[PDB]
Amino acid sequence: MKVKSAAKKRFKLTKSGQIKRKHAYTSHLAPHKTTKQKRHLRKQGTVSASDFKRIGNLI
């Protein structure tokens, strides 16, 4: 094994597990969305219920 460093460049380790992340819609442009869902994007988010097993095995 080894640690998937490229993946961990995108996460932020938190207390007692329960990894968090950033709301993911921004690469090229956003002149199509209202400011409400923009500031929804500005908030940091967390992984879903199911993907805990999909992320933990990477760790």
Partner: protein, 99 residues
């Protein structure tokens, strides 16, 4: 995952300029754990005989906490916490801020 774009690749990256360096190493001292142990004139010579730090210790100190204690705390540390300062100074101990 059977030919999908990976989740860590559809996610945004986290940027930091501390790259090329590391986090700042400092030994921690909290009021709660030190409450169990009895000691006065707590310095470099104190933690080595208490095995808290190694003989090769080079890490400076945080002081941390706001809990209450009835013992005369005697610390000679580099920096402190204001709530910890209040807690120790109310207890009529001694406060030395030796950077």
């Amino acid at each position: 995952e059977g030919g999908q774009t990976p989740l860590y690749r559809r996610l945004p990256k986290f940027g930091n300029a501390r790259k090329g360096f590391l986090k700042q190493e400092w030994v921690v001292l909290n009021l709660n754990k030190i409450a169990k142990l009895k000691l006065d004139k707590i310095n470099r010579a104190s933690l080595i005989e208490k095995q808290v730090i190694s003989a090769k210790s080079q890490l400076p100190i945080k002081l941390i906490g706001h809990t209450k204690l009835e013992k005369p705390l005697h610390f000679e540390v580099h920096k402190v916490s204001k709530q910890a300062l209040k807690a120790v100074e109310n207890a009529n101990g001694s406060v030395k801020l030796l950077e």
